[PDB]
Swiss-Prot record, chain C:
The chain holds residues 408 to 560 of 764 of the full protein. Changing residue 21 to C: Loss of capability to undergo conformational changes that lead to pore formation and translocation. This is Protective antigen PA-63. The record marks 49 as: Phi-clamp. Phe-49 residue forms the phi-clamp in the pore and catalyzes protein translocation via a charge-state-dependent Brownian ratchet. To pass through this hydrophobic restriction, substrate proteins LF and EF need to be unfolded prior to translocation. Disulfide bonds: none annotated.
Amino acid sequence: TVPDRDNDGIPDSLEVEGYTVDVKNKRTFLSPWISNIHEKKGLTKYKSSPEKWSTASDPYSDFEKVTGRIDKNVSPEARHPLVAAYPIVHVDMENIILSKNED
Amino acid sequence: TVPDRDNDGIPDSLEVEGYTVDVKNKRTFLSPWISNIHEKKGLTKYKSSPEKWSTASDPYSDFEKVTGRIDKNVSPEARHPLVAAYPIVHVDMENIILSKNED
Amino acid sequence: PTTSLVLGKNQTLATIKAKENQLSQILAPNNYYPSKNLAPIALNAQDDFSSTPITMNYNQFLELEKTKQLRLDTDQVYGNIATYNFENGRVRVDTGSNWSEVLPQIQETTARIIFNGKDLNLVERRIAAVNPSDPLETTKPDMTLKEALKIAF
Amino acid sequence: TPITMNYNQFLELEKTKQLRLDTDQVYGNIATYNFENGRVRVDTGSNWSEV
Ligand SMILES: [Ca+2]
Ligand SMILES: [Ca+2]
Ligand SMILES: [Ca+2]
Ligand SMILES: [Ca+2]
């Protein structure tokens, strides 16, 4: 049984030394990073915190992020484990209607 | 199985005799305090109550405190087990608006 | 959102948390609610059950039709996280957990980078970054600024 | 319902203009670290007055 301290599904040594996700047939593999074969495919190299279930502290595990098992609305640049995925919600008031309360 | 009466994850003898947390690769260890190797690294020596899950009685275990597995808003000086981490909330009234209820 | 209507400089007319009428089910990033083609929603009421008008008194009413200064602050925003369910793959919203639990955690452990090379609109990303004094935060991978620019923007 | 005030109180207030605001107590919840998935979660049961 491979070690996994943060319980996120990515093995610790993979998280520290680098890794990547790659479909082979129609299934995704979580391969450890390899210069000779992955770099040609344009696969991103991922590093994350072995001890944090989410490295960015946002509510999506590093595994969920890199494999895409995630809320799809999460914008693609935030799919990367080191990029925090959080809402920024501001309200703007398009116009204000007062009605005088007069008998 | 090492003894742990307060169930907080730090072994009793470690809690009494002193201990410290230290990353080695990208993982934190909860080492017993050692003069020759830890003092040079500037690591704080920690002591806590073996029988109290939190020594300061605040709702964060001594383990959670020293290892940083804690609410991040907890200010750094209160990360130390002997320093209580509690809110102090006072309300100030910036101004008071009375409206006379007159027909 | 907990909006607050402010007359003049900083005399707060009223603080209103949104009611069921003003609730927005989803708000995907780079989206408006209601969607930008539709007319904006009406905040009318102070009551939990949306049954009382947002009242304003005489001096406030006179000051408003004179100066016409009515700012709207956004004090805070309530909302829930939808999380992926490994079992049947559905994303589900936990109404227990909410973003106010998560956001301060993010702000306390990531470098913030605001950048406006995209048509001079500010874009704020947050990149996980080592915190030297926090033992758990040192376990994150080292973050050069160039790497941050590449992966975030 | 408005925070109401009666006539003698209203007169006394526009005369003396003394309206203090005491903070008798504060309700609030603790967010605690969840060892499983690392998220900090707020228990609405537990609250700071217990602690
Ligand atoms: Ca892991
Ligand atoms: Ca991780
Ligand atoms: Ca113990
Ligand atoms: Ca203890």
